[PDB]
Design a protein around this ligand. Structure first.
Ligand SMILES: CCCCCCCC/C=C\CCCCCCCC(=O)OC[C@H](O)CO
Ligand SMILES: CCCCCCCC/C=C\CCCCCCCC(=O)OC[C@H](O)CO
Ligand SMILES: CCCCCCCC/C=C\CCCCCCCC(=O)OC[C@H](O)CO
Ligand SMILES: CCCCCCCC/C=C\CCCCCCCC(=O)OC[C@H](O)CO
Ligand SMILES: CCCCCCCC/C=C\CCCCCCCC(=O)OC[C@H](O)CO
Length: 224
């Protein structure tokens, strides 16, 4: 009676897979947005990395320019980028537009994946299937560990290839005399920022496994 069973139960396995990656991407996307728009890390870094001596600016000047930049990167802001006290080139202006376009598009996919995760997740949970949580947690821990290595071994070369991968021009190659903002965006900050994203993704993996372990515990205790 098993002979007709090779062709069976394909649909729900697909939904779990789609939901698994949507949760994965959603966590990655939320982690990125948390770091890009959260000013606590950079505010800490101004003093810790001594950015005032790197940039030859005061602590409030650095915050003023950084605030204007982060506001510009918001999807709800439609004006152009105009730094309060720093010079900027045409190509530099074009680079920050590219950055904003990346952030907007990631947010758009993120909205789709969050709704696939929620709707697909309610469907599977109402089937008493909490497996998308396990698979989702697996993807969220493999991804940061896999990228930990290029950050640790050679962060600087990873930075250049990351840029060569995401951007289609060389405008990301800032000249401090034409785009002085680069002085107050030191590479060590980007490394802390990159490490911050992975930690949030890692934290997301913990939260998913923990909810998976809770639901499994409920069914086995439901037996008892
Ligand atoms: C189970 C999945 C868990 C997902 C959690 C993975 C880690 C992501 C961290 C935070 C996400 C929620 C925080 C809100 C996300 C957007 C943050 C933001 O927009 O920053 C605004 C800024 O604080 C204004 O100054
Ligand atoms: C339509 C259905 C959607 C359902 C799913 C929605 C869940 C939203 C979760 C996080 C929002 C993250 C959005 C990131 C936008 C950040 C904007 C921002 O924080 O602006 C900061 C400002 O620039 C500082 O001055
Ligand atoms: C239509 C859907 C097409 C898009 C498909 C999904 C989007 C994933 C793309 C890139 C992920 C990389 C995430 C990196 C987010 C931050 C990168 C960044 O902004 O770089 C800053 C740098 O300092 C500037 O020079
Ligand atoms: C203090 C330095 C911080 C860096 C280290 C932070 C901890 C790493 C996060 C999770 C590891 C495992 C703990 C919880 C398990 C969740 C990860 C997971 O999804 O593992 C699934 C596994 O396959 C099912 O056995
Ligand atoms: C190791 C390869 C990946 C390394 C990259 C991961 C870190 C980027 C993520 C968040 C940055 C948050 C700060 C956002 C500040 C604006 C980004 C920006 O436009 O920076 C200009 C750039 O430095 C012109 O070269």
């Amino acid at each position: 009676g098993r002979e007709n069973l090779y062709f069976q139960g394909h649909m729900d396995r697909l939904i779990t897979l789609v939901v698994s990656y949507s949760i994965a991407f959603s966590i990655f996307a939320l982690a990125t947005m948390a770091v890009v728009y959260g000013k606590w890390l950079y505010y800490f870094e101004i003093d810790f990395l001594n950015i005032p001596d790197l940039a030859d600016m005061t602590k409030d000047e650095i915050k003023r320019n950084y605030d204007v930049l982060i506001t510009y990167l918001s999807p709800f802001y439609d004006g152009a980028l105009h730094l309060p006290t720093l010079d900027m080139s045409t190509n530099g202006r074009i680079h920050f537009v590219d950055v904003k376009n990346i952030l907007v598009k990631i947010q758009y996919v993120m909205y789709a994946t969050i709704m696939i995760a929620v709707i697909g997740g309610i469907y599977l949970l109402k089937k008493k299937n909490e497996k998308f949580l396990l698979h989702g947690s697996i993807l969220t821990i493999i991804f940061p560990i896999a990228l930990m290595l290029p950050i640790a071994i050679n962060f600087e070369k990873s930075f250049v290839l990351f840029h060569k991968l995401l951007f289609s021009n060389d405008y990301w190659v800032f000249d401090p005399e034409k785009d002085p903002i680069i002085l107050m965006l030191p590479e060590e900050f980007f490394m802390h920022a990159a490490c911050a994203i992975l930690l949030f993704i890692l934290g997301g993996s913990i939260l998913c496994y923990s909810l998976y372990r809770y639901l499994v515990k409920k069914k086995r205790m439901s037996q008892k």
